[PDB]
């Protein structure tokens, strides 16, 4: 995986050049926002259980048919797999928020997830709706700082 600084390093290395003024400006901008991102990550970590609880509540309030018999979230096992997926999304979005780069989501989350969901019959639009509900919860909790990362997960499924 990469973070923002390693991404800038790779960008300057592909061109075979030392860091210039713009590169140092970008790295400084990343360092300046680090305290805020760490605060957001700690805030998410402190309330991960409650975020997950109310995110699943929102998802299954919007689409009750998933819980009903014949729905893709009807069994103890499939409900558990669903909330485990949402917990994965929250944790890896927090990782990406700390890193400032989405490569952790590509490496650890979207490595065959869309194929898995199409194979198992998991409804992708419902999963994106749940991811969006969690994005809204986290945004109301800490602000817009993490929205993009959740959108990334959505774009990996859509």
């Amino acid at each position: 995986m990469l973070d923002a600084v390693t991404k800038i390093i790779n960008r300057t290395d592909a061109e075979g050049r030392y860091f210039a003024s713009k590169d140092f400006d970008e790295v400084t901008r990343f360092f300046a926002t680090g305290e805020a991102r760490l605060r957001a990550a700690s805030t998410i970590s402190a309330n991960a259980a409650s975020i997950l609880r109310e995110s699943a509540a929102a998802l299954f309030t919007e689409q009750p048919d998933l819980l009903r018999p014949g729905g893709n979230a009807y069994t103890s096992r499939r409900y558990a797999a669903c909330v485990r997926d949402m917990e994965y999304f929250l944790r890896y979005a927090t990782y990406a928020l700390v890193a400032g780069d989405t490569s952790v989501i590509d490496e650890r989350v979207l490595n065959g997830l869309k194929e898995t969901y199409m194979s198992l019959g998991v409804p992708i639009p419902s999963t994106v709706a749940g991811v969006t509900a969690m994005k809204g919860v986290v945004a109301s909790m800490i602000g817009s700082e993490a929205n993009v990362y959740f959108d990334h997960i959505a774009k990996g499924l859509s």
């Binding site: 048919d65 998933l66 819980l67 009903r68 018999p69 014949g70 729905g71 009807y74």
Partner: protein, 54 residues
Amino acid sequence: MQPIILRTLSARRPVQGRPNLETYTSEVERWKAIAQTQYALELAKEMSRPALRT
């Protein structure tokens, strides 16, 4: 005016205050729970129907 007429007789009730109703409140809560169960059973019957068969 010399008949004995009594004006201000004391009342039956005692001077104390109202006894507390915690045990009565508990039994009322029990009745509430019993009544809630009979509606929750119907709504639960609704919850266990299949998903997309409207």
